[PDB]
C-alpha cells in the first residue's frame, strides 16, 4: 500500500 513514483516511498 506504499508507492514510489518520484524516486521515494509514500503512503498511497
Amino acid at each position: 500500500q506504499l508507492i514510489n513514483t518520484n524516486g521515494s516511498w509514500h503512503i498511497n
Partner: antibody, heavy 122, light 112 residues
C-alpha cells in the same frame, strides 16, 4: 511469462553514441520502473538510473547525468538508454531490470534482462 | 547519497558451513517500518538474482539456507549451510531513495 530483452548494444567507436533498448513483456509496463545497471568486465554492479513508464519520471546516478539518457515508448513496451560521447571506460555489460511502483512480493529487481555488452573501441 | 560497504570482500568456506556477510549503509535505509535493504546473488555470466528484500523477506524460488537481518544502517545475509552451487558474488542494495546503489560485493568461494 515476464521477460526483459536488452538490445542495441555491441561495438561502438569512442566519441560515438549508442541507443540501448529494454523490451518488456508479460506485465503492465506502466506499473514497473525500468532500471539500468552496468557491470565493467570483472567489476561490481553500478546503478545507472531509472524511468517511471507512466509519466517518464527519471532518476539518475550523478556520474551518468548529461551523457546517459533514459527514455520510453509506452506503445513498444521499451525503455531506452541513450549513451553519448562514449569512452573506453564505458566498456561494460548493460542490464535492465524492473522494480514495482507498489511495494509487495519480490517488488525489487524481480526480473533482469540477459544484459548486452557494449565495447567502446576504435 | 546512500552508499554501502560489505564485509568481507571475499571468503572461502566449506559445504555445510554457516556463512555471514555484512552490509553497512552510510545513512539509514528505514522508512514506514520497512528497512529498504536487498540482497542479490550473481553467478558467473548471469544477471543478479533477488534473494532477500526489505532485510528479511525471501524472494520466490530462493532456498531456505539464505536468510537476512538488520535495520537502519547495519545488515546481514546468512547462508545457513553452504552448498557447492552457492559460489557467487553477493550484493546488498538499497531501494529507499534514488540514487539507488549496490555494495561492492562479497565473493563467496567454496573450500574443498
Amino acid at each position: 511469462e515476464v521477460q526483459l530483452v536488452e538490445s542495441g548494444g555491441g561495438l561502438v567507436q569512442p566519441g560515438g553514441s549508442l541507443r540501448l533498448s529494454c523490451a518488456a513483456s508479460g506485465y503492465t509496463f506502466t506499473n514497473y520502473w525500468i532500471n539500468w545497471v552496468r557491470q565493467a568486465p570483472g567489476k561490481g554492479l553500478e546503478w545507472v538510473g531509472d524511468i517511471y513508464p507512466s509519466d517518464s519520471f527519471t532518476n539518475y546516478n550523478q556520474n551518468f547525468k548529461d551523457r546517459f539518457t533514459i527514455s520510453r515508448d509506452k506503445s513498444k513496451n521499451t525503455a531506452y538508454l541513450q549513451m553519448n560521447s562514449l569512452r573506453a571506460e564505458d566498456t561494460a555489460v548493460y542490464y535492465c531490470a524492473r522494480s514495482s511502483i507498489y511495494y509487495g512480493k519480490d517488488y525489487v529487481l524481480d526480473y533482469w534482462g540477459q544484459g548486452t555488452l557494449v565495447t567502446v573501441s576504435s | 547519497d546512500i552508499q554501502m560497504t560489505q564485509s568481507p570482500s571475499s571468503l572461502s568456506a566449506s559445504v555445510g558451513d554457516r556463512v555471514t556477510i555484512t552490509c553497512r549503509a552510510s545513512e539509514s535505509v528505514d522508512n514506514y517500518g520497512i528497512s529498504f535493504m536487498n540482497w542479490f546473488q550473481q553467478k558467473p555470466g548471469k544477471a543478479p538474482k533477488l534473494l532477500i528484500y526489505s532485510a528479511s523477506n525471501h524472494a520466490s524460488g530462493v532456498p531456505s539456507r539464505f536468510s537476512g537481518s538488520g535495520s537502519g544502517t547495519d545488515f546481514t545475509l546468512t547462508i545457513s549451510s553452504l552448498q557447492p552451487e552457492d559460489f557467487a558474488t553477493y550484493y546488498c542494495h538499497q531501494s529507499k531513495e534514488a540514487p539507488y546503489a549496490f555494495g561492492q560485493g562479497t565473493k563467496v568461494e567454496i573450500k574443498r
